[PDB]
Design a protein around this ligand. Structure first.
Ligand SMILES: [Mg+2]
Ligand SMILES: [Mg+2]
Ligand SMILES: [Mg+2]
Ligand SMILES: [Mg+2]
Ligand SMILES: [Mg+2]
Ligand SMILES: [Mg+2]
Ligand SMILES: [Mg+2]
Ligand SMILES: [Mg+2]
Ligand SMILES: [Mg+2]
Ligand SMILES: [Mg+2]
Ligand SMILES: [Mg+2]
Ligand SMILES: [Mg+2]
Ligand SMILES: [Mg+2]
Ligand SMILES: [Mg+2]
Ligand SMILES: [Mg+2]
Ligand SMILES: [Mg+2]
Ligand SMILES: [Mg+2]
Ligand SMILES: [Mg+2]
Ligand SMILES: [Mg+2]
Ligand SMILES: [Mg+2]
Ligand SMILES: [Mg+2]
Ligand SMILES: [Mg+2]
Ligand SMILES: [Mg+2]
Ligand SMILES: [Mg+2]
Ligand SMILES: [Mg+2]
Ligand SMILES: [Mg+2]
Ligand SMILES: [Mg+2]
Ligand SMILES: [Mg+2]
Ligand SMILES: [Mg+2]
Ligand SMILES: [Mg+2]
Ligand SMILES: [Mg+2]
Ligand SMILES: [Mg+2]
Ligand SMILES: [Mg+2]
Ligand SMILES: [Mg+2]
Ligand SMILES: [Mg+2]
Ligand SMILES: [Mg+2]
Ligand SMILES: [Mg+2]
Ligand SMILES: [Mg+2]
Ligand SMILES: [Mg+2]
Ligand SMILES: [Mg+2]
Ligand SMILES: [Mg+2]
Ligand SMILES: [Mg+2]
Ligand SMILES: [Mg+2]
Ligand SMILES: [Mg+2]
Ligand SMILES: [Mg+2]
Ligand SMILES: [Mg+2]
Ligand SMILES: [Mg+2]
Ligand SMILES: [Mg+2]
Ligand SMILES: [Mg+2]
Ligand SMILES: [Mg+2]
Ligand SMILES: [Mg+2]
Ligand SMILES: [Mg+2]
Ligand SMILES: [Mg+2]
Ligand SMILES: [Mg+2]
Ligand SMILES: [Mg+2]
Ligand SMILES: [Mg+2]
Ligand SMILES: [Mg+2]
Ligand SMILES: [Mg+2]
Ligand SMILES: [Mg+2]
Ligand SMILES: [Mg+2]
Ligand SMILES: [Mg+2]
Ligand SMILES: [Mg+2]
Ligand SMILES: [Mg+2]
Ligand SMILES: [Mg+2]
Ligand SMILES: [Mg+2]
Ligand SMILES: [Mg+2]
Ligand SMILES: [Mg+2]
Ligand SMILES: [Mg+2]
Ligand SMILES: [Mg+2]
Ligand SMILES: [Mg+2]
Ligand SMILES: [Mg+2]
Ligand SMILES: [Mg+2]
Ligand SMILES: [Mg+2]
Ligand SMILES: [Mg+2]
Ligand SMILES: [Mg+2]
Ligand SMILES: [Mg+2]
Ligand SMILES: [Mg+2]
Ligand SMILES: [Mg+2]
Ligand SMILES: [Mg+2]
Ligand SMILES: [Mg+2]
Ligand SMILES: [Mg+2]
Ligand SMILES: [Mg+2]
Ligand SMILES: [Mg+2]
Ligand SMILES: [Mg+2]
Ligand SMILES: [Mg+2]
Ligand SMILES: [Mg+2]
Ligand SMILES: [Mg+2]
Ligand SMILES: [Mg+2]
Lengths: 200, 113, 61, 85
RNA sequence: UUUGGAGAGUUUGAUCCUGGCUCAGGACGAACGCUGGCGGCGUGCUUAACACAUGCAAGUCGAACGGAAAGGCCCUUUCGGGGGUACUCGAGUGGCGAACGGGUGAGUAACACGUGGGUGAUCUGCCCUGCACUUUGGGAUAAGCCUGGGAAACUGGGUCUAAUACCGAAUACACCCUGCUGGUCGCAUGGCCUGGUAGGGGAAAGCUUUUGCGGUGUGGGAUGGGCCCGCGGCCUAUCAGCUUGUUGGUGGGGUGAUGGCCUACCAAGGCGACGACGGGUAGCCGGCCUGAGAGGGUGACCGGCCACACUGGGACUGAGAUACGGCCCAGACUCCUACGGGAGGCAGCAGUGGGGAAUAUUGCACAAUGGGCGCAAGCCUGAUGCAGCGACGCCGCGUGAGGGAUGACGGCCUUCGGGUUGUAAACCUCUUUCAGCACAGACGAAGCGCAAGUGACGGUAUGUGCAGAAGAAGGACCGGCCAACUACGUGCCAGCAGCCGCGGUAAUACGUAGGGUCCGAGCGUUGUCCGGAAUUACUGGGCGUAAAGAGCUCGUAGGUGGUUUGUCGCGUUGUUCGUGAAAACUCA
């Protein structure tokens, strides 16, 4: 069950842009609604809620999915925040988005769900597909000849591909080698607050 | 009256079978004395694994394996080894080794570059 | 035992079928069990559109 | 008593149980014959009576009427009795 | 040498202490209201151990026997049927199976269960492996035929027949007893050395001509068991003494086994405040939940034991019996009944009546495994393997996207400037996952038979084509705890509420509208169990005024103990070995 309503409204309500191309956000940075200008009492609960809402609604992940992501990260021997952010980035939708083959998380998720890609020579169609270290992702010809995919691959001038991701050729092959580090991910927001709240 | 039995474990769509030596009056999934082998029907290799020494010891002390267990004994080589008529021959076929992910990656990188 | 009557209206009378649950009311001293709204011979209250599942009224069309 | 198998098993059980009762009666007759022989206090009559009793008990053990250990213990009891008395 | 502890609200004009109450998380063998697309996976009488229609849930051997009622073949035919064949077999004798398998938890405070041993005091078909063998004679009967009661089941009388069915005798000195006679051990009697010696006794069935099975006594394996022991595991003095085979010993009986186990004769004792005898509850364990830990609750499914088959007694069988579809007797219930007499135990698989909140279809197969019978072919299997119903719980997928305006209708506010739903939408394109329509079509079966075949699942799963954004979303909350506000309608009325507490005309707390937050094929309410609860405090606490030093003495059981010498290894501590099933949790 995906989200159908507006993507700009969440950015307006939570006070920080998400897509980055949102003109309405900068047009009216104040909260939407009839009384967005009214002052709101500051509270740790409010802060934690805003951070977790930002993360979950920016990545489009579902709530139970995020919850067992967090539990797996906590059980992981490494630090909970790092494990959570790495497993969250491991999602194939975000992988392709940061590889630059996709312009938006929603369209990337739909493409993965319909399964225009090939995983190790076998077609897999799961938006929340787990991608591990040292994997291979291929592209089908029905996707290569697809118009929007051509537009993306010939207009991929978005933010630079991260270290763990890299494209090899026109086939748009994505590879992962090592375990991302929080610092070199440099993701917005912070994870210490979210882990604290989920510990609460 | 000890006989070797197959215990139904695993999953409905691909059953998994152990090879067990137990009394004839015990359960299909209950009391067991030892675990000695297994059977995998789903894999078309049809992986077979058995403890030759334990099987030989049980056959010597006087087990009465059923028809399927005896067939598996022929397939592995234990029954004909005990009987001594043809000798010891291995008809089992090993699963095809999976090509290494490292060499697959190397070939893919070479093709790309 | 006692029994509380929720809703703005009701049609209960002597010799009526009733289904009850547990819930405390501060104002009246000894009531702790509330009659379920809209079951058996008891029907849901009318003119209810929000908070509807609690009092058991059908959805508008 | 519902089906042919168990009704037949019944029939056979009662028949061969009549036979069993006859044989057990014979063994018990030998036993109390020895009992009253000892009570009277006979020696040679007791000798042949116990010879017959041992023969009967051994045959009963052979055909399964009584446990062979049971027969052996009974015979040992007869021997202890005749030697003490 | 490694793993891990959170608070908040609530008494007062204001402060602190103790202490009560409520909330934020997880779980269910769940129920209810609303809603409700698909695929995969587990699970489905916790109450009335209430009463049950119905159909099934245990049979097999002609290579044991007498035989041919029904089939086949060959002789014959009038198509009524007359002979043999054993291919085949009704019913009847004769072996084996039938204590296996499957359900339930009323009874138990007990060796019943786990744990670790003893059994010099034990038994053991079917299996394997050794030793010596496996002579002879005889009576009887089922069956078949005749016949009586009677609708009935079943039953009396006469005639008659075979077997591996029954019964004498042929030996047996590896077997069991009694009298005399040596070596080791200790666990005490006494065991073992198959110690030695004198006497006594101990049984068999054949068929088949084929991958052969049977009959007697003895040695060893392995399973199967039987008896006993130290430790462990609820509450309760508003239960203080209990017992006469009860305690200990001598002669007999007895079982397989040692044994007041029973009987006869002797002595009067044993257990008791380190809780007997009483009263209440309850099957136990590997586990599950919670909890860092100690600790607490619980016995779902699965796995191993204990006990039960309407209630209460008794006995035979067998190597094996609480003998759930074996037997005899006593009580309640039901049914047929020609009124002479008979028949019954679903807590086995389905199903019916009642209970309540609730728990299913009177479904398909031996295709794989287990079990039972037979030399095999072969036969049975409601065990087992599968399907149907239930969003009961777990996991997954679908109801779209790229660009699109300082942002087109309509709605609510408005300080009347104007803002909201809104990248939403109409739009140009896209591939369209699963449904929908067709084709192919599995493995599960190195399996069974000496036949020529063998898949219930299923023609499902799964691949190959066709059409079209075409078919698919709702429920709670928005005063603070506790992420989320405006307008309108009645105002101590009607109403909300887990706590604080909210309406007495201008309610962000009542009802209705827009807007927002949360969740999502689930959303809310109820119940139960743990946590925070250091709020039973051993690890973690107090007793002057908040709950708490009995009004003071004497004194039994126990606890506890000043300084030193020797000795014991009970407490304590080190090393090594056996065991701690499977399943369960963690790592890969
Ligand atoms: Mg296989
Ligand atoms: Mg008599
Ligand atoms: Mg004789
Ligand atoms: Mg830890
Ligand atoms: Mg106050
Ligand atoms: Mg006050
Ligand atoms: Mg205190
Ligand atoms: Mg306190
Ligand atoms: Mg519904
Ligand atoms: Mg699939
Ligand atoms: Mg189910
Ligand atoms: Mg019936
Ligand atoms: Mg039979
Ligand atoms: Mg017959
Ligand atoms: Mg036989
Ligand atoms: Mg039984
Ligand atoms: Mg038996
Ligand atoms: Mg059982
Ligand atoms: Mg029950
Ligand atoms: Mg009970
Ligand atoms: Mg009883
Ligand atoms: Mg008691
Ligand atoms: Mg025990
Ligand atoms: Mg036990
Ligand atoms: Mg007769
Ligand atoms: Mg004769
Ligand atoms: Mg005989
Ligand atoms: Mg000797
Ligand atoms: Mg002799
Ligand atoms: Mg003789
Ligand atoms: Mg003979
Ligand atoms: Mg032997
Ligand atoms: Mg032996
Ligand atoms: Mg034992
Ligand atoms: Mg013991
Ligand atoms: Mg104990
Ligand atoms: Mg006594
Ligand atoms: Mg006396
Ligand atoms: Mg005795
Ligand atoms: Mg006595
Ligand atoms: Mg835990
Ligand atoms: Mg514990
Ligand atoms: Mg308990
Ligand atoms: Mg239980
Ligand atoms: Mg169990
Ligand atoms: Mg009974
Ligand atoms: Mg009953
Ligand atoms: Mg009873
Ligand atoms: Mg017996
Ligand atoms: Mg037996
Ligand atoms: Mg029986
Ligand atoms: Mg029955
Ligand atoms: Mg039933
Ligand atoms: Mg009812
Ligand atoms: Mg089977
Ligand atoms: Mg079988
Ligand atoms: Mg065969
Ligand atoms: Mg049958
Ligand atoms: Mg059948
Ligand atoms: Mg479903
Ligand atoms: Mg439901
Ligand atoms: Mg239900
Ligand atoms: Mg859009
Ligand atoms: Mg599909
Ligand atoms: Mg197959
Ligand atoms: Mg195959
Ligand atoms: Mg508020
Ligand atoms: Mg607030
Ligand atoms: Mg309200
Ligand atoms: Mg309300
Ligand atoms: Mg007003
Ligand atoms: Mg709203
Ligand atoms: Mg879901
Ligand atoms: Mg605690
Ligand atoms: Mg907590
Ligand atoms: Mg505590
Ligand atoms: Mg509580
Ligand atoms: Mg004091
Ligand atoms: Mg005082
Ligand atoms: Mg005193
Ligand atoms: Mg005083
Ligand atoms: Mg004193
Ligand atoms: Mg003292
Ligand atoms: Mg002392
Ligand atoms: Mg001292
Ligand atoms: Mg010591
Ligand atoms: Mg274990
Ligand atoms: Mg584990």
């Amino acid at each position: 069950a995906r989200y159908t309503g507006p993507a700009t409204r969440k950015s307006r309500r939570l006070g920080v842009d998400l897509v980055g191309g949102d003109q309405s956000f900068e047009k009216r940075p104040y909260p939407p609604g009839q009384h967005g200008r009214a002052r709101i009492k500051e509270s740790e609960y409010r802060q934690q809620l805003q951070e977790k809402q930002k993360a979950r609604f920016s990545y489009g992940v579902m709530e139970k999915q995020f919850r067992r992501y967090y539990e797996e990260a906590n059980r992981q021997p490494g630090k909970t925040g790092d494990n959570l952010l790495r497993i969250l980035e491991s999602r194939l939708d975000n992988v392709v988005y940061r590889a630059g083959l996709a312009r938006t998380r929603r369209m990337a998720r739909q493409l993965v769900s319909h399964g225009h890609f090939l995983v190790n020579g076998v077609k897999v169609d799961i938006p929340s597909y787990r991608v591990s270290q040292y994997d291979i992702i291929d592209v089908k010809e029905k996707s290569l000849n697809t118009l929007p995919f051509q537009i993306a691959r010939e207009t991929a001038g978005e933010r630079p591909i991260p270290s763990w991701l890299q494209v090899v050729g026109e086939r748009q092959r994505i590879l992962v080698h090592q375990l991302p580090e929080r610092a070199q991910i440099d993701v917005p927001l912070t994870e210490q607050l979210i882990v604290e709240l989920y510990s609460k | 009256a000890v006989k070797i039995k197959l215990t139904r474990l695993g999953k409905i769509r691909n059953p998994q079978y152990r090879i067990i030596v137990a009394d004839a009056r015990t359960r299909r999934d209950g009391r067991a004395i030892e675990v000695i082998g297994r059977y995998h029907p789903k894999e078309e290799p049809s992986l077979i694994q058995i403890d030759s020494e334990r099987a030989q010891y049980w056959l010597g002390v006087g087990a009465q394996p059923t028809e399927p267990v005896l067939a598996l004994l022929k397939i592995t080589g234990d029954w004909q080894k005990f009987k001594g008529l043809p000798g010891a021959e291995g008809t089992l076929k090993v699963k095809e080794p999976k090509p290494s992910k490292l060499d697959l990656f190397n070939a893919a990188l070479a093709e790309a570059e | 035992v006692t029994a509380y009557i929720p809703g703005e209206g009701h049609n209960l009378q002597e010799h009526s079928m009733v289904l009850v649950r547990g819930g405390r009311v501060k104002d009246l001293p000894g009531v702790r069990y509330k009659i379920i709204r809209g079951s058996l011979d008891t029907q849901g209250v009318k003119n209810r559109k929000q908070a509807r599942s609690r009092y058991g009224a059908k959805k508008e069309k | 008593a519902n089906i042919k198998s168990q009704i037949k098993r019944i029939r056979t059980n009662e028949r061969r149980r009549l036979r069993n009762q006859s044989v057990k009666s014979s063994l018990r007759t030998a036993i109390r014959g020895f009992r009253e022989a000892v009570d009277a206090g006979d020696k040679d009559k007791a000798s042949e009576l116990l010879h017959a009793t041992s023969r009967k008990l051994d045959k009963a053990a052979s055909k399964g009427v009584i446990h062979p250990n049971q027969a052996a213990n009974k015979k040992s009891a007869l021997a202890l009795a005749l030697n003490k008395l």
